[PDB]
Design an enzyme around this catalytic site. Structure first.
Site, PDB file in Angstrom:
ATOM      1  N   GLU A  59      39.307  39.887  47.249  1.00 30.19           N
ATOM      2  CA  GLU A  59      39.060  41.194  46.643  1.00 30.19           C
ATOM      3  C   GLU A  59      40.333  42.026  46.731  1.00 30.19           C
ATOM      4  O   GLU A  59      40.648  42.793  45.819  1.00 30.19           O
ATOM      5  CB  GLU A  59      37.909  41.910  47.355  1.00 30.19           C
ATOM      6  CG  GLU A  59      36.532  41.489  46.844  1.00 30.19           C
ATOM      7  CD  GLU A  59      35.390  42.124  47.630  1.00 30.19           C
ATOM      8  OE1 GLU A  59      35.545  43.284  48.073  1.00 30.19           O
ATOM      9  OE2 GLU A  59      34.334  41.463  47.787  1.00 30.19           O
ATOM     10  N   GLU A  69      48.396  47.477  37.090  1.00 23.55           N
ATOM     11  CA  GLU A  69      48.297  47.709  35.642  1.00 23.55           C
ATOM     12  C   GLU A  69      48.376  49.181  35.246  1.00 23.55           C
ATOM     13  O   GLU A  69      47.567  49.992  35.687  1.00 23.55           O
ATOM     14  CB  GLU A  69      46.989  47.122  35.103  1.00 23.55           C
ATOM     15  CG  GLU A  69      46.877  45.606  35.215  1.00 23.55           C
ATOM     16  CD  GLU A  69      47.832  44.868  34.286  1.00 23.55           C
ATOM     17  OE1 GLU A  69      48.340  45.490  33.327  1.00 23.55           O
ATOM     18  OE2 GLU A  69      48.055  43.658  34.507  1.00 23.55           O
ATOM     19  N   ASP A 110      31.695  43.343  42.285  1.00 27.26           N
ATOM     20  CA  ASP A 110      32.873  43.697  43.045  1.00 27.26           C
ATOM     21  C   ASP A 110      33.749  44.805  42.487  1.00 27.26           C
ATOM     22  O   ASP A 110      34.222  45.634  43.260  1.00 27.26           O
ATOM     23  CB  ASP A 110      33.688  42.443  43.344  1.00 27.26           C
ATOM     24  CG  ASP A 110      32.876  41.417  44.131  1.00 27.26           C
ATOM     25  OD1 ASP A 110      31.985  41.840  44.902  1.00 27.26           O
ATOM     26  OD2 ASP A 110      33.113  40.206  43.984  1.00 27.26           O
ATOM     27  N   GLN A 126      33.353  39.973  39.125  1.00 24.27           N
ATOM     28  CA  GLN A 126      32.729  39.477  40.345  1.00 24.27           C
ATOM     29  C   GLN A 126      33.764  38.468  40.867  1.00 24.27           C
ATOM     30  O   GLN A 126      34.252  37.616  40.118  1.00 24.27           O
ATOM     31  CB  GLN A 126      31.394  38.763  40.073  1.00 24.27           C
ATOM     32  CG  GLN A 126      30.806  38.094  41.328  1.00 24.27           C
ATOM     33  CD  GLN A 126      30.384  39.081  42.412  1.00 24.27           C
ATOM     34  OE1 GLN A 126      30.353  38.742  43.600  1.00 24.27           O
ATOM     35  NE2 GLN A 126      30.038  40.296  42.010  1.00 24.27           N
ATOM     36  N   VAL A 127      34.105  38.592  42.141  1.00 25.73           N
ATOM     37  CA  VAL A 127      35.084  37.740  42.802  1.00 25.73           C
ATOM     38  C   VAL A 127      34.372  36.647  43.618  1.00 25.73           C
ATOM     39  O   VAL A 127      33.466  36.941  44.385  1.00 25.73           O
ATOM     40  CB  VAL A 127      35.946  38.617  43.724  1.00 25.73           C
ATOM     41  CG1 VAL A 127      36.841  37.787  44.551  1.00 25.73           C
ATOM     42  CG2 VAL A 127      36.741  39.610  42.883  1.00 25.73           C
ATOM     43  N   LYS A 128      34.775  35.391  43.446  1.00 21.71           N
ATOM     44  CA  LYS A 128      34.145  34.286  44.173  1.00 21.71           C
ATOM     45  C   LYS A 128      35.120  33.186  44.540  1.00 21.71           C
ATOM     46  O   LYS A 128      36.070  32.928  43.803  1.00 21.71           O
ATOM     47  CB  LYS A 128      33.067  33.610  43.312  1.00 21.71           C
ATOM     48  CG  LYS A 128      31.797  34.403  43.061  1.00 21.71           C
ATOM     49  CD  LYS A 128      31.017  34.610  44.347  1.00 21.71           C
ATOM     50  CE  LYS A 128      29.732  35.376  44.073  1.00 21.71           C
ATOM     51  NZ  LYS A 128      29.020  35.737  45.331  1.00 21.71           N
TER      52      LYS A 128
HETATM   53 MG   LIG Z   1      32.057  38.568  45.385  1.00 24.19          MG
END
Ligand SMILES: [Mg+2]
Lengths: 264, 49
Positions: A59, A69, A110, A126-128
């Site tokens: 994250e 950015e 996220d 969404q971070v995975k």
């Molecule tokens: Mg996540």
């Protein structure tokens, strides 16, 4: 733990978590809800003026990339999805809604990002870990989330460790190899003088300048770099993360003018 | 109305992540499959080049 009780949920909704924009936003989850299997980070953002709550190194990588950015206007981490909507989506999709000890849990995305212009004015992430995509339950929860944003007509994407730029990865390794140093009032007081030096030495290499600054003020070996490193890791200083930090010129560093609200 | 079990994921909609998983090339990862479909993207793709 990361699981909440019915009263904890109601209480968080009352304090308005998930609501607000920019400096007024409060994330649904905080570093206190970090899973025992990971590391949390609290980092200042020049774009929002807030100290963000990131619950993993992954994250953190996405946050630093977003903050870099120019078009990003707002970054709302740990954004909660309306329970009544996810409840209905689970039913319609034939998926058991997330629940812990009989208590339906509030799902969260996220990052919800707003941009000033460019390809996407708003998008969610969404971070995975990539390996997690092989897990059936993880996939079920991702499908619920996917449907949620599709319903809202807002682009949604998944980001894994494999999407982190290689140079960004090495910079995070160096910047966060060890436990992030606590920012004292004395260290925070260095932003102003450091900003002036970096300003005039704009065309010079950051590492050379830090060393030349130690020599000049007869400081301990590597003193200035250690200060810059700590302020950068905490977010008060941002740089061109797509270039090795050691290769950044002083003009590549953006230093924030902050006031320690301790006094006023 | 019934919770779909993994064995029946091959009956779900084309864009459902569960269906995609069921029809994936087992010698490849889900990551590779989703990135190919644009579900997974790197930062560059989301901003002006
Ligand atoms: Mg996540």
């Amino acid at each position: 733990n990361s699981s909440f009780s019915e009263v904890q949920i109601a209480r968080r909704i009352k304090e308005g978590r998930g609501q607000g924009h920019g400096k007024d936003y409060i994330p649904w989850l905080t570093v206190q809800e970090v899973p025992s299997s990971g590391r949390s980070h609290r980092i200042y953002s020049h774009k929002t003026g807030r100290v963000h709550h990131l619950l993993s190194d992954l994250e953190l990588a996405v946050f630093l990339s977003l903050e870099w950015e120019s078009s990003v206007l707002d970054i709302r981490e740990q954004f909660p999805l309306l329970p009544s909507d996810t409840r209905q989506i689970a039913i319609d999709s034939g998926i058991k809604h997330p629940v812990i000890r009989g208590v339906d849990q509030v799902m969260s995305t996220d990052f919800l990002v707003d941009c000033k212009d460019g390809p996407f004015e708003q998008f969610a992430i969404q971070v995975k870990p990539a390996a997690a995509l092989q897990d059936e339950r993880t996939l079920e929860k991702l499908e619920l989330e996917r449907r949620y944003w599709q319903q809202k007509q807002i682009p949604w994407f998944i980001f894994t460790d494999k999407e982190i730029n290689p140079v960004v990865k090495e910079n995070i390794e160096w910047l966060y190899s060890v436990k992030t140093e606590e920012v004292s009032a004395e260290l925070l007081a260095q932003l102003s003088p450091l900003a002036h030096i970096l300003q005039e030495k704009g065309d010079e290499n950051i590492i050379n300048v830090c060393k030349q600054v130690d020599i000049a003020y007869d400081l301990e070996l590597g003193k200035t770099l250690s200060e810059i490193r700590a302020l950068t890791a905490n977010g008060f200083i941002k740089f061109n993360i797509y270039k090795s930090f050691r290769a950044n010129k002083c003009a590549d560093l953006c230093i924030s003018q902050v006031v320690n609200m301790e006094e006023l | 109305i019934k919770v779909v079990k993994p064995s029946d994921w091959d009956s779900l909609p084309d864009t459902d992540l569960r269906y995609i998983y069921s029809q994936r090339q087992p010698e490849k990862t889900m990551h590779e499959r989703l990135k190919g479909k644009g579900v997974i993207v790197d930062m560059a793709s989301l901003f002006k080049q």
